[PDB]
């Protein structure tokens, strides 16, 4: 059955996200990217509007709020967690079966017990992709890593034959308030060097998206454009 929504709802959110992807797509192509739709506070009415639509990468930001929604809606969705990650909920996380990708991985310690939780918890899904969060600021933020040694232990874990339940898949940056995207492109270039890895970006929001896509990234990350 679903959840219920309204029609003249409908209608204008499937046009706001059509013209956010049509501007994604025509960006690209002056230079597919991934249009990651952030639904985090949004209702679930609003993510069936667009779920029937044909969207399936939806992003959210708290545990509970994810893990309920998961359970409301259609288990084809592939959810990505991108807000702060604790290292107590890295259990609660690793049994929704359909989380595909979490992307705010900034420590050994998260990578370790998620990957271990995922082992305990859902064995048999596919491992979840990870991207590793960096502070791209230069300032002191609240999350993502900014030490190069400890940034290169991380990936090592990833990379190591121990790490089965979850794979390394890109960086991710928050930014700041482009030199964030250009720093994390360097990052990816001195990873990439070091490691044999080819990872992709994750950078760009509602305000910042085109400068992303111009700077190389691989996935933009989209709320108040789209829900409006
Ligand atoms: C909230 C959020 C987004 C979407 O921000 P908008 O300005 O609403 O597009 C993207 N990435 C992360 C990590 C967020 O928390």
């Known amino acids: 059955?679903?959840?219920?929504?309204?029609?003249?709802?409908?209608?204008?959110?499937?046009?706001?996200?059509?013209?956010?992807?049509?501007?994604?797509?025509?960006?690209?192509?002056?230079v597919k990217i991934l249009l990651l739709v952030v639904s985090k506070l949004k209702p679930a009415s609003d993510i069936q509007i667009l779920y029937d639509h044909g969207v399936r990468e939806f992003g959210e930001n708290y545990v509970?709020?994810?893990?309920?929604?998961?359970?409301?809606?259609?288990?084809?969705?592939?959810?990505?967690?991108?807000?702060?990650?604790?290292?107590?909920?890295?259990?609660?996380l690793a049994k929704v079966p359909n989380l595909y990708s979490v992307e705010?991985?900034?420590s050994?310690?998260?990578?370790?017990?998620?990957n271990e939780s995922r082992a305990k918890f859902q064995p048999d899904c596919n491992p979840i992709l990870c991207?590793?969060?960096?502070?791209?600021?230069?300032?002191?933020?609240?999350?993502?890593?900014?030490?190069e040694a400890e940034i290169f232990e991380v990936i090592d874990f990833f990379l190591s034959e121990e790490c089965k339940y979850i794979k390394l898949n890109g960086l991710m940056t928050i930014g700041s308030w482009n030199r964030d995207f250009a720093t994390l492109v360097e990052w990816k270039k001195k990873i990439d060097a070091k490691f044999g890895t080819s990872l992709k970006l994750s950078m760009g929001m509602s305000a910042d998206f085109r400068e992303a896509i111009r700077q190389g990234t691989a996935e933009v990350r989209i709320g108040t454009d789209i829900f409006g």
């Open 1 to 30: 059955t679903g959840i219920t929504y309204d029609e003249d709802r409908k209608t204008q959110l499937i046009a706001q996200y059509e013209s956010v992807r049509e501007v994604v797509n025509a960006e690209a192509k002056n």
């Open 104 to 106: 705010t991985i900034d």
């Open 131 to 147: 991207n590793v969060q960096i502070n791209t600021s230069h300032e002191d933020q609240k999350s993502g890593l900014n030490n």
């Open 64 to 92: 509970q709020e994810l893990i309920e929604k998961a359970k409301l809606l259609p288990d084809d969705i592939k959810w990505h967690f991108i807000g702060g990650l604790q290292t107590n909920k890295c259990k609660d």
């Open 108 to 114: 050994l310690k998260k990578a370790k017990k998620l």
